[PDB]
Each structure stands twice: as structure tokens, then as C-alpha cells.
Design a protein around this ligand. Structure first.
Ligand SMILES: Oc1ccc([C@@H]2Oc3ccc(O)cc3[C@@H]3CCC[C@@H]32)cc1
Ligand SMILES: Oc1ccc([C@@H]2Oc3ccc(O)cc3[C@@H]3CCC[C@@H]32)cc1
Lengths: 221, 227
């Protein structure tokens, strides 16, 4: 299956699987009248969640897992995925978070709700780091997919377990390769290739932290 | 400074910097025992941090913010490490080896416990080396609060940290190149190891919510500030 896909096929698939960029729902006319910040953000996240699933299903090696396992991986990584998506489209908007093309917010607008400025600042911080690293879209899609498969993978001791975890680690290893390949093609030396790799995979650690803070908050609202 | 250290010098330093293994004070409260343990370790953690190549070259405020941000992750990867040869148990101390069950003793601890165990297994399953361990522990320190620090001094710092991090990334690969792994095997195990830090982050988060439900920066700074 995915295990036989070539670097260029893996990327290609990943780029194809990309979900559309949704808009924030709201009648522009009248005001901004606090029109519930969470309201707008939550509603946006809900509609994206759907498109996220069809996406997951197209991530090479994902469908080959059991249904219970597909649900546990998504449940475990939906916010991380939503965030890396944000952080990605907010790259060309230093100081702002492009939640939607018609909903670009700034650090300030984040103080509107309690607890949201810290998160906001973290997302911004991350968006900068990606811009500073000149993250490519091919690299992005890879990371997004590594998140899906690596997030809930250590929270799955039956035998069925084993078989599954092996497949996941093989897809992950397959993506790690794809990434290196993307960097080898871009002209980076070997040492440069694994340094950027470590840098990118260490950013996911931050995106994990953000998802955690994002959920405590969600559980507080 | 550290930026000129060779792979073998980096590792060597790291191995030397290793803190001692403390005992649980007792012959009783679970959190009590665990908390008291974590407190005494915290001291030894600082002396350690100070010996991580490139760390002391940062400002005091930055040293305190990195540790404050990664103390629990560090304590945990340490646990997960010594609990490698005790499948099904967490070797908090040599005289305090607990099992999943004893974790149900306190509310909210069994989930944590199961995550720690799950991780401990993954390390055992990967046959993680001690040289690789010390590297990871050090990558945590430097990478944890690095994205929660915009001045100029600020830019100087982040660059140094990303350089030490890159230096360690190298050391790791070197460790794997020496062990016989192919190039592809070298970067795969790298990605696998670095992805486990993401989990160790998640565990530190859960560990703090739990801690929170039952003042450190001033406590760590009182320590880092030596004469
Ligand atoms: O595509 C995306 C990406 C992200 C989001 C919002 O991110 C936040 C950031 C900071 C917050 O205090 C809340 C939120 C919303 C709570 C979960 C996600 C949602 C929507 C849509
Ligand atoms: O070296 C270590 C490493 C780790 C620990 C314990 O980790 C926990 C894990 C899960 C918990 O519900 C509580 C704790 C204790 C509360 C802070 C840390 C302490 C002690 C010593």
C-alpha cells in the first residue's frame, strides 16, 4: 500500500488530499459586536472538522487501520491538526492569525476572551518560526500527516495493538523519508537535511503543547 | 563554546552532567512521596542544566524560564528511562517502584501512569541507548520554552539555542552512524525519538493540570542565581 509509494507519490497524494479553506460564517453587515469570538471560532472549527475526516482518509496508510483506531487518532489530534493548519496560512501575515480569509485576527482581538491571548501568542510565535524557516508546502503536508499518526499512537496491549502500531510506525518512517527526500532535492547537505528535520519535528512538540492549552480553555468555556 | 565541541565531547559532557538517583524518603501519601521526591530532584536538576553545553551562556532570566517550562518533562523522561527494565512498573526511586494499580490510589494518576508506562515500553522497544537518552533530555531543556520567550538580546538568545539544538541533532546522528545504522535508518530513528518528545510534552501538560488541582519561578531563580 502506502509502504510502496515513492517519495514523489507520497507528497503528491498528500498535496491532493488537502482540504479546502473555509470562511467564517457571519452576516458582515451591522457590526463586529463581539459576535462571540469563540462563537465564530468554534463554528469555524466544526465545519473544518468534517473536511478534516475526508482528508485523514486520504492520508496514505490511514484507512488501513481499524475504524476504532482511526477515530482515536483523530480524536487525539484534531486540534493539533487544526492549529498547524492555521499556523500555516498565517505565515504571510506577521502579527496576525488568518483563521479564515474573512477572519484575520490580531493579538489584541485575542484579549477579547479570557485565556485566549496566551494561546494566540503561542500560535503567532509558531507562525513566525515557520516563516523564519521558510517552510515549504510539501514539508507542511508531511508534518500535518505525521501529527495525525503520531498523536494518539502511544495511547492505544492486545495483539491487535501490536500489528497496528507497526503499520503506523512504518508509515511514519515512510514520511520521515519523504521529508528528507524533499530537502535533498532542495539542495541541502546531509547535515543540513537532518538538522532541519529535527527542527521541524521539534515544532510539533510545541503544537502539541498548544493543543493541550487549547483544550483546557475549551473545557473552561 | 559548546558550538565547537565534537560529537564525542558533547556526549561525554552530557554523560558527566547526569544527576544522581535519589531515594524516596520513607520506610504513606502517594503524592506526598512523589512530590517530596520531585522537590529534592529539582535541586540536582539545576546543577545538571548548568552543565548542559551552551546553557549557562544564556541570560539568567532565560535559564529560569527554560527550566520552569521543562522541569516536569525532564523529570518524566528521567523516570521513563529508569523504568525501562521494569515492564509494567515505574521506578520512581530504587525504593519506590510502583505499578499501574498503586496509581489508582490517587484520582487522575492512573491515566498519567499509563502514559508513562506506555512511553517506558516504547524506549525499551527501541532499545534506546544512554547516550541517546542524555541527548534527548538536553533537547527538551532547550526546546521546551524556547517558543515562549522579541528584543535584539532576544534574537541573540534564540539563535544560540537553535545552534546548540542543531549541534545535538548532529551528535545524535553521529551516535547512530557509529552504531551501524544506514543513513535512512539514522534519520528514521531520529524522527522516532524526536516524536516521542511530543508525547513527553503531552504528559507534562497532563501532569501539571493534575498538580494544579491540589512559587516555582521564584524558587528556580533563587537557585540559578548563585554566588
Ligand atoms: O482552522 C482553525 C483553527 C483554529 C481554530 C480555533 O483555534 C483557537 C485558538 C485559540 C483559542 O483560544 C481558541 C481556538 C478555537 C478552539 C479550538 C480551535 C479554535 C479554528 C479553526
Ligand atoms: O524523577 C521523578 C519524575 C516524576 C515524578 C512524579 O511525576 C508524577 C507523575 C504523575 C503524577 O500524577 C504525579 C507526579 C509527581 C508530581 C510531579 C512529579 C512527580 C517524581 C520524580
Amino acid at each position: 500500500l502506502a509502504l510502496s509509494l515513492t517519495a514523489d507519490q507520497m507528497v503528491s497524494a498528500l498535496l491532493d488530499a488537502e482540504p479546502p479553506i473555509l470562511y467564517s460564517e457571519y452576516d458582515p453587515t451591522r457590526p463586529f459586536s463581539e459576535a462571540s469570538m469563540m462563537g465564530l471560532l468554534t463554528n469555524l472549527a466544526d465545519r473544518e472538522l468534517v473536511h478534516m475526516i475526508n482528508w485523514a482518509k486520504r492520508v496514505p496508510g490511514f484507512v488501513d487501520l481499524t475504524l476504532h483506531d482511526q477515530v482515536h487518532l483523530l480524536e487525539s489530534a484534531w486540534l493539533e491538526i487544526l492549529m498547524i493548519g492555521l499556523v500555516w496560512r498565517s505565515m504571510e501575515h506577521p502579527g496576525k492569525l488568518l483563521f479564515a480569509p474573512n477572519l484575520l485576527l490580531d493579538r489584541n482581538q485575542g484579549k477579547s476572551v479570557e485565556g485566549m491571548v496566551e494561546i494566540f501568542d503561542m500560535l503567532l510565535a509558531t507562525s513566525s518560526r515557520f516563516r523564519m524557516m521558510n517552510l515549504q508546502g510539501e514539508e507542511f503536508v508531511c508534518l500535518k500527516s505525521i501529527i495525525l499518526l503520531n498523536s494518539g499512537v502511544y495511547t492505544f496491549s492486545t495483539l491487535k495493538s501490536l500489528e497496528e502500531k507497526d503499520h503506523i510506525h512504518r508509515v511514519l518512517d515512510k514520511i520521515t523519508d519523504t521529508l528528507i527526500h524533499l530537502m535533498a532535492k532542495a539542495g541541502l547537505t546531509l547535515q543540513q537535511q537532518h538538522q532541519r528535520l529535527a527542527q521541524l519535528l521539534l515544532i510539533l512538540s510545541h503544537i502539541r503543547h498548544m493543543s493541550n492549552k487549547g483544550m483546557e480553555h475549551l473545557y473552561s468555556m
